[PDB]
Design an enzyme around this catalytic site. Structure first.
Site, PDB file in Angstrom:
ATOM      1  N   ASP A 126      32.893  62.220  13.871  1.00  0.00           N
ATOM      2  CA  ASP A 126      31.675  62.667  14.671  1.00  0.00           C
ATOM      3  C   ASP A 126      31.356  63.948  14.909  1.00  0.00           C
ATOM      4  O   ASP A 126      31.939  64.715  15.885  1.00  0.00           O
ATOM      5  CB  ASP A 126      31.946  61.949  16.066  1.00  0.00           C
ATOM      6  CG  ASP A 126      30.635  61.608  16.898  1.00  0.00           C
ATOM      7  OD1 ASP A 126      29.815  62.040  16.920  1.00  0.00           O
ATOM      8  OD2 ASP A 126      30.958  60.738  18.026  1.00  0.00           O
ATOM      9  N   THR A 127      30.282  64.510  14.630  1.00  0.00           N
ATOM     10  CA  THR A 127      29.991  65.928  14.796  1.00  0.00           C
ATOM     11  C   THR A 127      29.322  65.896  16.265  1.00  0.00           C
ATOM     12  O   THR A 127      28.824  67.138  16.647  1.00  0.00           O
ATOM     13  CB  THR A 127      29.020  66.520  13.846  1.00  0.00           C
ATOM     14  OG1 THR A 127      27.665  65.559  13.686  1.00  0.00           O
ATOM     15  CG2 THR A 127      29.553  66.383  12.474  1.00  0.00           C
ATOM     16  N   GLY A 128      28.892  64.942  16.698  1.00  0.00           N
ATOM     17  CA  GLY A 128      28.445  64.852  18.142  1.00  0.00           C
ATOM     18  C   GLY A 128      29.507  65.314  19.334  1.00  0.00           C
ATOM     19  O   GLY A 128      29.096  65.147  20.379  1.00  0.00           O
TER      20      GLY A 128
END
Lengths: 95, 95
Positions: A25-27
């Site tokens: 997850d880059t978020g």
């Protein structure tokens, strides 16, 4: 190698030898996972505002790499590997 | 080129000429943004369960590319470009 993003990027990792499926997850800034038991040696953390257990210097193996990092365990609907582990794994977003 | 993940990957995009800062989120399947006005021609959508307006075939320019895609506008605490736009932009996760 690269991962294309047509499918949610969920991979299998071994944390201290315990298998878990996680979302890259880059978020997310940090990583939280559930369903594994890392032990009595943790720092209680508060992150809604759930209660988590922070473990540092944990051995994780995923994508052909073996790293040591920090991970939190606690009630999470999704197991997520956030940017704190993505960077330690040498991952980048390409375009 | 590549983006390293030490910082949250927030970039500036122009959607139909309106500037917005968005998060390139591999953890999101779709994209939702706020603060721009795309017009009366949308399909009401329900995604907690917020009410959104879905626009299709919208011109977006970000990272040197100009694409047409689908985007939803509505109350979101963060403006996010999910996998539906990341793939249309030819982005991959490298390791």
């Amino acid at each position: 190698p690269q991962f294309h993003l047509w499918k949610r990027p969920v991979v299998t990792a071994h944390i201290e030898g315990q298998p878990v499926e996680v979302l890259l997850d880059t978020g997310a800034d940090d990583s939280i996972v559930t369903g594994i038991e890392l032990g009595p040696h943790y720092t209680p953390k508060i992150v809604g505002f759930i209660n988590t257990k922070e473990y540092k210097n944990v051995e994780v193996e995923v994508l052909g790499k073996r790293i040591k990092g920090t991970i939190m365990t606690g009630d999470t609907p999704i197991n997520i590997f956030g940017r704190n582990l993505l960077t330690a794994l040498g991952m980048s977003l390409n375009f």
